[PDB]
């Protein structure tokens, strides 16, 4: 996350971190339930073996809330394409259930129509992760969050050198130096409504980080709510 602020105690409890063999984060995730993590399908090629860590805010200290979980099943969307990043979504079933506590809780899944009409028409969403704090920098040791404006769909298509499919939406800033970045992929994009946070996106891709005339591209969770529901039933 470029710009934004640190997630403070209890503020980003649905954040998951996909960790490789070296116990280093490479992607984010969103806790959906005690057994399921939402992530990007493209994250599933960046490590041969990975686990999921929850309840972490500082990768340099043991704060007592951290928990590592092994993955039992990887459910990648079968229509995911590396060419365009269309259908960039996957669900992970954990081997053991997550025990909710301080810094560990799920984000809510909304209903499609209401989310499109009421959540996606709000001014902003919130993206979070342990990703780079500058385009050329190292991964953050601290969990960060950033308020990102929803971007007009036409403006986004106009800004993009590549196809924005029906399964994608744009968020962030034209010139302001704030955006998601490398390592934030697969992480949460949530929208607040009356003090309740609903999953609205998955950090997907961008032409660099925080570049002028460029926005962050997110998987449109509302297009995949039935798919998610099915994946979580088996």
């Amino acid at each position: 996350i470029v710009g934004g602020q640190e997630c403070k105690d209890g503020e980003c409890p649905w954040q998951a971190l996909l960790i490789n063999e070296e116990n280093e984060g490479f992607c984010g995730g969103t806790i959906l339930s005690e057994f399921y993590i939402l992530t990007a399908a493209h994250c599933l090629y960046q490590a041969k073996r990975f686990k999921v860590r929850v309840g972490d805010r500082n990768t340099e200290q043991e704060e007592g809330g951290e928990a590592v979980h092994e993955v039992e099943v990887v459910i990648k969307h079968n229509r995911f394409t590396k060419e365009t990043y269309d259908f960039d979504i996957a669900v992970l079933r954990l081997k053991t259930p997550i025990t909710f506590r301080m810094n560990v809780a799920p984000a809510c899944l909304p209903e499609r129509d209401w989310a499109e009409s009421t959540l996606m028409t709000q001014k902003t969403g919130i993206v979070s992760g342990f990703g780079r704090t500058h385009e050329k920098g190292r991964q953050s040791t601290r969990l960060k969050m950033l308020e990102v404006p929803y971007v007009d769909r036409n403006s986004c298509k106009l800004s993009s050198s590549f196809i924005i499919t029906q399964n994608m939406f744009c968020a962030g800033y034209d010139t302001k130096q704030e955006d998601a970045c490398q390592g934030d992929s697969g992480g949460p994009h949530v929208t607040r409504f009356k003090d309740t946070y609903f999953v609205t996106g998955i950090v997907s891709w961008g032409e660099g980080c925080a570049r002028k005339g460029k926005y962050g591209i997110y998987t449109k969770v509302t297009a995949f709510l039935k798919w998610i529901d099915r994946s979580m039933k088996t």
Binding site: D9, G10, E11, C12, P13, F100, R101, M102, N103, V104, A105, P106, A107, C108, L109, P110, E111, D113, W114, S117, T118, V190, F193, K194, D195, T196, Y197, F198
Partner: protein, 52 residues
């Protein structure tokens, strides 16, 4: 602005227009309150809530 278009139909969460009237509902882990509008967590750590 009418029904769900007017202040989310007074619903805490989901709003549906059925038979030209507002119907409120809630995410899993919440129960619709007796007023048929508010959403009450059914147990500890409900979805979408920051902790403590």
């Amino acid at each position: 602005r009418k029904l769900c278009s007017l202040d989310n139909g007074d619903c805490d969460q989901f709003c549906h227009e059925e038979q030209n009237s507002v119907v409120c509902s809630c995410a899993r882990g919440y129960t619709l309150a007796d007023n048929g509008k508010a959403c009450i967590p059914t147990g500890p750590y409900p979805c979408g809530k920051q902790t403590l």
